[PDB]
Amino acid sequence: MQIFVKTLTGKTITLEVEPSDTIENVKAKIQDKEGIPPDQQRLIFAGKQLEDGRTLSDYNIQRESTLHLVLRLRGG
Amino acid sequence: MQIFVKTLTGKTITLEVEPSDTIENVKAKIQDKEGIPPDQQRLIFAGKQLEDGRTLSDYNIQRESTLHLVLRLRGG
Amino acid sequence: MQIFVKTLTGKTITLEVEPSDTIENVKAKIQDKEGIPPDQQRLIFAGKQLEDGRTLSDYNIQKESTLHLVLRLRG
Amino acid sequence: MQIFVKTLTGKTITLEVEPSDTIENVKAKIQDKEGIPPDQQRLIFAGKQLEDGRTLSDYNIQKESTLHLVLRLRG
Amino acid sequence: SKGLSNEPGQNSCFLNSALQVLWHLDIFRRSFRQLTTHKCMGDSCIFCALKGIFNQFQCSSEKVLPSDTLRSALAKTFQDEQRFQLGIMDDAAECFENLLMRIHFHIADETKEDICTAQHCISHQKFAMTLFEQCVCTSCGATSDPLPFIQMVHYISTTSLCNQAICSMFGELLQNASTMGDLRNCPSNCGERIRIRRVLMNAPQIITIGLVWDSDHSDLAEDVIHSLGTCLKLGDLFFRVTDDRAKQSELYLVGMICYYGKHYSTFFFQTKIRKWMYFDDAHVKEIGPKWKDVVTKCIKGHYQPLLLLYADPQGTPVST
Amino acid sequence: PSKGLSNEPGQNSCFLNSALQVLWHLDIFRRSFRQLTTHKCMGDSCIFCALKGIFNQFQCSSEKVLPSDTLRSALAKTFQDEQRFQLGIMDDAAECFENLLMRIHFHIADETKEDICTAQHCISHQKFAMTLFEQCVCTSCGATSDPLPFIQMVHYISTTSLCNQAICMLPSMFGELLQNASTMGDLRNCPSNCGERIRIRRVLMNAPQIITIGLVWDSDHSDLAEDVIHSLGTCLKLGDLFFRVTDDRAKQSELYLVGMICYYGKHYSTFFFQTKIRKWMYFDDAHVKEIGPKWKDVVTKCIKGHYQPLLLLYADPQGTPVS
Ligand SMILES: [Cl-]
Ligand SMILES: [Cl-]
Ligand code: NA
Ligand SMILES: [Zn+2]
Ligand SMILES: [Zn+2]
Ligand SMILES: [Zn+2]
Ligand SMILES: [Zn+2]
Ligand SMILES: [Zn+2]
Ligand SMILES: [Zn+2]
């Protein structure tokens, strides 16, 4: 299923994923297309922050769902 | 499989895992026993940092192996 | 551990709390700073209103978290 | 980008550098600050010696990284 | 237009004020009519009490209607926390908020992850604000851990709405007001101080604003009514708005709950008559077409608006 | 057995002969290497094969002096692209020592997907290597940096840091002295900038049975040599050598100085305590001499010759060869 990851700059990422894919794998796929280290990534869906251990199926994240990518990083 | 996780205070976390468990999978078990968020967790074995997306059998981590848990804290 | 509270004036005060504190305790400390009785105090954290009886840890209120104080208008 | 160099005397200095900088480029900056000629310079990062022709990016030298300088004694 | 009854000791104008708003918002009413399924609580069921009141609002020919069926379902549902109890005086915004929550609890399949996906849930599909808070330092890059949550009402301080007014486009006024005391140190303590950012992620078609008051006898009342705007551009209510529908969404002031001396009232725009209306429990009265009259009625009675309700003119009820 | 290694005018092999003497005289290494039958051979040029031929001569030959030219040649061919250890060119004994240990691992172990040596026959990783991680930790605010793990065969410490920390202290303290000297300049800012300062912390997670200390010199004619020699101790407590020592075998480990590669005047030589004769030997290529049974005898010679110790080898006397 193609899921949509939306970033703060406005870029709407599209990824081919399956419900088995853990949030860590979604973060990996994101790194394959943006170069953002998963340790700096935080995913958000329906106001809930998704955990890397859980999987899309655990959140009922159906196809064509839009996810929100917020980055938690340090300075300098 | 029983593997052991050494904290820097000397506490030992015993974990029941499979060779096919990923590192993010192991960090989730550590959170179940300690409440340590996985984003704070860094795991070290044989002088190498363990990558979230790779498995325990990738690093040839066997029974009774000892992993070292180092934490990244923001502080304050 | 310190905590931020957004008062009715729109300003922020700092409260010294521990996570095992009930919110009646947090309400009492707000009363010593802002002078509002706890019965007129509505405390909102992350959308939900803190129901008296729970502790600060039951809402995952860590250090430097900001509570939104709201005057209850019984009518 | 800022990196640290632990010098022959145990003192820590600061190198202003770029990820695309060859380590021979880094060795020249160390010569100007510390006076050690390049052929006598041994740069160790994470237990491994840096070999000429490579850049800081090749070794994942990032900001706040520390290079350990050892003096080469040809005999 | 109808009215609601309060016995001498009933002390129920908090419910009645909120009951009028829900009945008059076209989005909530037209949605609620296409609902024939709910987790009934039996006797302490808010849905069935609510339902019963909406049937009489549409079919009954009486001028004043009873709301005691909702008062008991509210008192029994909240008997463990001693809220909205039978006879006591309570808060109207609290009542308006817990009513929306209790509705969702009746129209949801209790998702384990607590997400709400129900296409028919009015409280989440039309009213709820899904956003997150985050501290972003633009000088050193640092960034705090994002805090996401859902709120049903956006609360803004009165001392801040007025002050920013002293300092057409009152969405920026609300955003500038809501962020007044939100200065924080940089997450990495680089020396810089930043303001907390909130960015909305969905597209609510009804935006309900809460006004935090300083006392039951506020002297800012008159100035607060003078700073209110009728047209609200959703694209400016928050630091950022992700949904494009919200980016171009303009919402009009449609209803409002007011407090005055331990009592509650409700002003509302009946679009079927193009005139603002007034409901003080059982006493109904027409105000006029111009919003200026609502202002004059309010500043003449020292009213304190507690809840402001903005509706998307091009809104839609829930869909199958 | 104490024999010499030939060095002809121009071949500049004293840096290799100095390292070779250490490896042959180190009990945990020599006995381990003898039990090693199979190896990843590189062909006619192969360090393991040249090393074995040298070690077999050290035991079976009756000649007072032996040639290292086979290992010299194999080292040159192995590092031709790096332009190191080339024929006729001087080189560094500690670099030579390090790389011999590294290539021994390449000859003994197998390439693992994650570059993790676990082979019980690898002398370098099983007995020499130190497994560490570095971290910045602030006690005041609790902030911690990302741990940086790595493996090293030699622990390098500055000679000026060593001499200075010796004056501050003015046996059973040499470990603490080495640790305070190593950490002297490792002051950094808090990872989160609370305003306080921190010291880089090094944590040893394994238990080497041979610790190789490398002295970082300021000059090739150092005027700190005498103070360095007088600052060196003969007993190392491994549990004190690093800020943290997490392995129980290493907390209890006590290692004694048995070898020392020395630099002087663009030349290299080696002192070693033969546990049999109970005396300190000295090997300068072909010249083998009896220094004496007391460490002071080595001190007197090093100070008189202005010798600059480069590698110190501390061996656990309760250590064991590879299984
Ligand atoms: Cl030469
Ligand atoms: Cl210690
Ligand atoms: Na992760
Ligand atoms: Zn019911
Ligand atoms: Zn809902
Ligand atoms: Zn900053
Ligand atoms: Zn061979
Ligand atoms: Zn090895
Ligand atoms: Zn700190």
Residue numbers in the entry:
A (entry chain F), B (entry chain C): 1 to 76
C (entry chain E), D (entry chain B): 1 to 75
E (entry chain D): 30 to 196, 207 to 359
F (entry chain A): 29 to 198, 206 to 358
Copy the relevant paper text.
Ubiquitin-specific proteases (USPs) represent the largest class of human deubiquitinases (DUBs) and comprise its phylogenetically most distant members USP53 and USP54, which are annotated as catalytically inactive pseudoenzymes. Here, we report the discovery that USP53 and USP54 are active DUBs with high specificity for K63-linked polyubiquitin. Assays with substrate-bound polyubiquitin reveal that USP54 cleaves within K63-linked chains, whereas USP53 can en bloc deubiquitinate substrate proteins in a K63-linkage-dependent manner. Biochemical and structural analyses uncover underlying K63-specific S2 ubiquitin-binding sites within their catalytic domains.
Following construct optimization, we obtained crystals for the most stable complex, USP54 conjugated to diubiquitin–PA, allowing the determination of a structure to 2.5-Å resolution by X-ray crystallography. Its asymmetric unit contained four copies of USP54 conjugated to diubiquitin–PA, of which two copies formed an identical arrangement. Excellent electron density covering the entire complex revealed that the two ubiquitin moieties of the probe engaged two different USP54 copies with symmetrical binding in trans configuration. To assess the solution state of this complex, size-exclusion chromatography with multiangle light scattering (SEC–MALS) measurements were performed, proving that all USP54 samples are monomeric in solution. These results allowed the assignment of the dimeric arrangement of USP54 conjugated to diubiquitin–PA as a crystal artifact, likely derived from stabilization of the finger domain of USP54. We propose that, in solution, the complex of USP54 conjugated to diubiquitin–PA exists as a monomer and that USP54 engages K63-linked ubiquitin chains through its S1 and the S2 sites in cis configuration. USP54 adopts the USP DUB catalytic domain fold consisting of hand, thumb and finger subdomains. A canonical catalytic triad was positioned in an active conformation, with the warhead of the diubiquitin–PA probe covalently linked to the catalytic cysteine. Moreover, the structure revealed three coordinated zinc ions, which comprised two positions within the thumb subdomain in addition to the common position at the tip of the fingers. In USP54, the S1 ubiquitin displayed a ~30° rotation in comparison to the common binding mode and differed in all three main interaction sites. The structure of USP54 conjugated to diubiquitin–PA uncovered an S2 ubiquitin-binding site within its USP domain, consistent with biochemical assay data. This interface is centered on the backside of the fingers subdomain and is governed by hydrophobic interactions with the I44 patch of ubiquitin.
